[PDB]
Design a protein around this ligand. Structure first.
Ligand SMILES: CCCCCCCCCCCCCCCC(=O)O
Ligand SMILES: CCCCCCCCCCCCCCCC(=O)O
Ligand SMILES: [Fe+2]
Ligand SMILES: [Fe+2]
Ligand SMILES: [Fe+2]
Ligand SMILES: [Fe+2]
Ligand SMILES: [Mn+2]
Ligand SMILES: [Mn+2]
Lengths: 272, 284
């Protein structure tokens, strides 16, 4: 049951950080994947040899599944914060979820346009990828339906925002630009990546805000955050190692970028 | 756990009716409540007598709570359809949810701008209003976390889309225009209402699609739909009667602005909306 409503008893908290992020999301998140011209991407893909075609698919497989997972798996966080009365967080999260919908749409439109929509790309998800995206991510989010404790919320935001988005996805954009911008390939996909990267800046800000406001209640939660980050590292690097070996471009450059992002995300939360 | 992912094994179903509705939502849902000029609304509200100021508040109280309720209460539907693998429905529902956020924001910005943000408007929710919005709506939606049966989904879409949006809110837009557009008052609120009404057409279409696809599986569910509509009517009309009674006890705004407010035409619009929603679902 609803006890009452914040915008009847009072108003939105106009100064709340998540209301301010919501306002930014509306002003900056206007792109439509349906407007991207993928016609040259189709011709670029056809120009590749069979071996070069295969080389591009593991990264796309990781992104399509990843965007689909985050579209579905943010819903428990929205529910948990709604149940806690965090209205401004909920408003922001409507933009987060609509951003992810666009991300899923974008990669799927690319697959369709280049002629691989009919190909099952699941073959490029190894055990480490599945441990994160098929298992750990939905487990941590769904937990929030029955357990919205600080510990549960930190774990959810750690897996979702700091690892999935802040480590793997961030490193994926970089990788795609290092390879394909340089090769002059897939301009429509790279335009989509640029819009997506802008959206995801907001998503990471929500994760940092959420983790830090809980850590501020108790430094014991800081140690939980670091432990959950380290818990998932073997799977992050296990997936990275798998893509790197498929790749055979400076792969050690890309690998160190992943490590850089992982340590960066840790440093964006303060014990204090 | 996720078994796999549709956009890895295949693609989005580009022809799915809810993918098409999602596409329309992106194209047509561009407005931003933060861009509405409420400065004239502020002046209008201040120029009103206390007894004219009051006349508008019961309707605004109904919409602010309603929009906040639907913002929160759509989440279980999105979850239930997601768990069923209905990806295109989920994509569309992201636009539904972000629409509702804008609707909550819009009415809250109006209240803030006109100087009533600090006033507790709960006093204009009677028992019938509370049975719909404080109780029946969240109960029917939350049910979906543990019971996503066809019966549960039809009941959820009936309460949310056909009654709350398709009968009450639709009648509220009409009432607001019948009163304040003719008066020449609250231009920013009216702009917001117009944007909102456009969004809500899609929300009702989602409800029709959802109910109809379940009725298509088994025509027995059509009688469930009709029954659930009829179960809620006493509270729809109980709330309408309450707002009508309030409006008839304060007629200064109508006298001042020469509006022959026909509450019996509004009451008949509510009845028309209710019966019209029923006709939009067919047995076969
Ligand atoms: C060889 C260098 C490895 C680079 C790492 C590539 C990782 C693939 C990215 C897939 C994760 C996508 C998750 C979506 C998160 C979001 O968009 O919010
Ligand atoms: C005197 C005529 C009575 C007219 C009825 C007024 C009803 C007020 C509307 C409040 C419900 C708002 C619910 C929001 C639903 C949505 O926008 O999705
Ligand atoms: Fe994201
Ligand atoms: Fe391994
Ligand atoms: Fe709606
Ligand atoms: Fe009554
Ligand atoms: Mn994304
Ligand atoms: Mn609405």
């Amino acid at each position: 049951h609803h006890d009452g409503f914040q915008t009847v008893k009072a108003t939105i908290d106009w100064e709340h950080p998540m209301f301010k992020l919501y306002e930014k999301a509306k002003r900056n998140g206007k792109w439509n994947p349906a407007d991207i011209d993928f016609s040259q991407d189709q011709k670029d893909f056809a120009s590749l040899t069979s071996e070069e075609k295969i080389s591009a698919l593991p990264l796309v497989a990781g992104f399509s599944a990843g965007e689909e997972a985050v579209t579905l798996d943010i819903l428990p966080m929205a529910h948990a914060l709604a149940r806690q009365g965090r209205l401004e967080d909920v408003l922001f999260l409507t933009t987060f979820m609509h951003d992810e919908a666009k991300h899923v749409e974008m990669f799927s439109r690319w697959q369709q346009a280049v002629g691989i929509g009919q190909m099952d790309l699941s073959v490029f998800h190894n055990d480490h990828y599945k441990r994160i995206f098929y298992e750990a991510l939905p487990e941590a989010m769904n937990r929030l339906y029955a357990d919205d404790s600080p510990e549960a919320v930190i774990r959810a935001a750690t897996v979702f925002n700091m690892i999935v988005e802040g480590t793997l996805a961030e490193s994926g954009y970089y990788t795609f630009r290092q390879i394909y911008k340089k090769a002059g390939l897939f301009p429509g996909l790279l335009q989509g990546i640029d819009y997506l990267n802008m959206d995801e800046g907001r998503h990471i800000q929500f994760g940092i805000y959420t983790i830090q406001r809980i850590v501020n209640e108790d430094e014991r939660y800081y140690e939980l955050f670091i432990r959950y980050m380290d818990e998932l590292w073997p799977h992050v690097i296990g997936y990275v190692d798998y893509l790197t070996e498929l790749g055979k471009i400076d792969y050690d450059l890309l690998r160190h970028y992943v490590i850089k992002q992982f340590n960066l995300r840790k440093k964006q939360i303060s014990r204090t």
